[PDB]
């Protein structure tokens, strides 16, 4: 399956720099026209700027010219993003995409959280949520990581009908979040629940087997 | 810069219904070349990066349905969706393709209305990993009601507690248009242990009376 593939949050310390790459995958990078695009917490879409793999010639937004530089490595067929002197301003999800003509369909990558902060990263504690002593439903506790996102799924993707994640909440510097998981109950403890969770900013990752109390 | 600007901000539709969005470019997308207007509408729904619905005003990418129509010419567009779906629940965008920098409109997001629905609420006990660490947290998930608006209380042996309360909402269910919250507490391993009865207490429109779920920490 064609698809576009993206780096993995990070965690970068006002002043500094990073570079966020996007690879293709099952295609090549020759053939499309790759854009960058920024998205703001709660705030809306911006396109920062274009390339062209075929001469390296790009062209941005003026307003980010002098913070943003894209290049290409056409024989790993990687884009890559250089954000400089970094801010605040400078924390969002940072996506690329481009037009395919065979597949008439524009590939979006995943988004690459950054995340523009003195503090330190500090991976979850994640919890099993067994019931107390038809259907019966189950969650998972992750709690004080820092900084975001944390991708929480449970069977690894299987189970995901009636699963519910909740948005992250600060309190402390450190966010914390929970999903449960609502089943038949036959399932139940017959057939076992496993809450994973990993995440991207301090690479480390998590399986936790809801058993019964 | 063309100015790429969109209305309304969010409109409240009903499964069913049949929508319609405008976009208005302060300069003109027409190609008198090519005879394209340049504008493209994206959908984002939450948590997902932008999917495309439509190149050139109307041509709709690979898979798109056709619920999705672009109609428009020159400096006014409008999207329109007949018959919207529980799925169809997000933030749509326009873009300028015409001339640089390629600028995008500022958003419609699309939220759904329905029928009432009372929340479905569970406990947790604080767990065993977590004692162990001498930190305890009780959670209570109210899920799927409609509306939104609910209140949950705690109460510790009966009174009342806020001090150190999360609460958090999820969006509405792209499956039953229903929202989710979690309320979860922290306590001390101390605290824990001084008492033995909790209660999670919601309140809903739905009901006349709270719902309560409650555990004993023996047990």
């Known amino acids: 399956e064609v698809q576009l593939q993206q780096s993995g949050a990070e965690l970068v310390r006002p002043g500094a720099s990073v570079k966020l790459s996007c690879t293709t995958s099952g295609f090549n990078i020759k053939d499309i026209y790759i854009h960058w695009v920024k998205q703001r917490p709660e705030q809306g879409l911006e396109w920062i700027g274009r390339?062209?793999?075929?001469?390296?010639?790009?062209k941005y937004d003026p307003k980010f010219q002098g913070k943003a530089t894209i290049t290409v490595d056409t024989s790993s067929n990687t884009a890559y993003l250089h954000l400089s002197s970094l801010t605040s301003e400078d924390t969002a999800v940072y996506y690329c995409d481009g037009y395919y003509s065979y597949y008439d369909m524009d590939y979006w990558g995943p988004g690459t959280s950054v995340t523009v902060s003195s503090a330190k990263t500090t991976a979850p504690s994640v919890y099993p949520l067994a019931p107390v002593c038809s259907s019966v439903t189950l969650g998972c506790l992750v709690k004080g990581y820092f900084p975001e996102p944390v991708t929480l799924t449970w069977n690894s993707g299987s189970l995901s009908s009636g699963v519910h994640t909740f948005p992250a909440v600060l309190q402390s510097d450190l966010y914390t979040l929970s999903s449960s998981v609502t089943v038949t109950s036959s399932t139940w403890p017959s057939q076992s629940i496993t809450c994973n969770v990993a995440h991207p900013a301090s690479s480390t990752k998590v399986d936790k087997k809801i058993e019964p109390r | 810069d063309i100015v790429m600007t969109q209305s309304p901000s969010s409109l409240t539709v009903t499964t069913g219904e049949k929508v319609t969005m405008t976009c208005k470019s302060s300069q003109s997308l027409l190609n008198s070349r090519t005879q394209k207007n340049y504008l493209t509408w994206y959908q984002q729904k939450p948590g997902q990066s932008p999917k495309l619905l439509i190149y050139?005003?109307?041509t709709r990418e690979s898979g798109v349905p056709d619920r999705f129509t672009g109609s428009g010419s020159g400096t006014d567009f409008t999207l329109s969706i007949s018959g919207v779906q529980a799925e169809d629940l997000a933030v749509y965008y326009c873009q300028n393709n015409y001339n640089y920098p390629l600028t995008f409109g500022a958003g419609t997001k699309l939220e759904l209305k329905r029928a009432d629905a009372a929340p479905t609420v569970s406990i947790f006990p604080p767990s065993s990993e977590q004692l162990t660490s001498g930190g305890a947290s009780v959670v209570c998930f109210l899920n799927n009601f409609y509306p939104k608006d609910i209140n949950v209380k705690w109460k510790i042996d009966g009174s009342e507690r806020q001090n150190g309360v999360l609460n958090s909402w999820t969006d509405q269910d792209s499956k039953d248009s229903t929202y989710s919250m979690s309320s979860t507490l922290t306590l001390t391993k101390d605290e824990y242990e001084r008492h033995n009865s909790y209660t999670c207490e919601a309140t809903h429109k739905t009901s006349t009376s709270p719902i309560v779920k409650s555990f004993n920490r023996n047990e």
């Open positions: 050139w005003a109307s």
């Open positions: 390339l062209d793999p075929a001469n390296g010639y790009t």
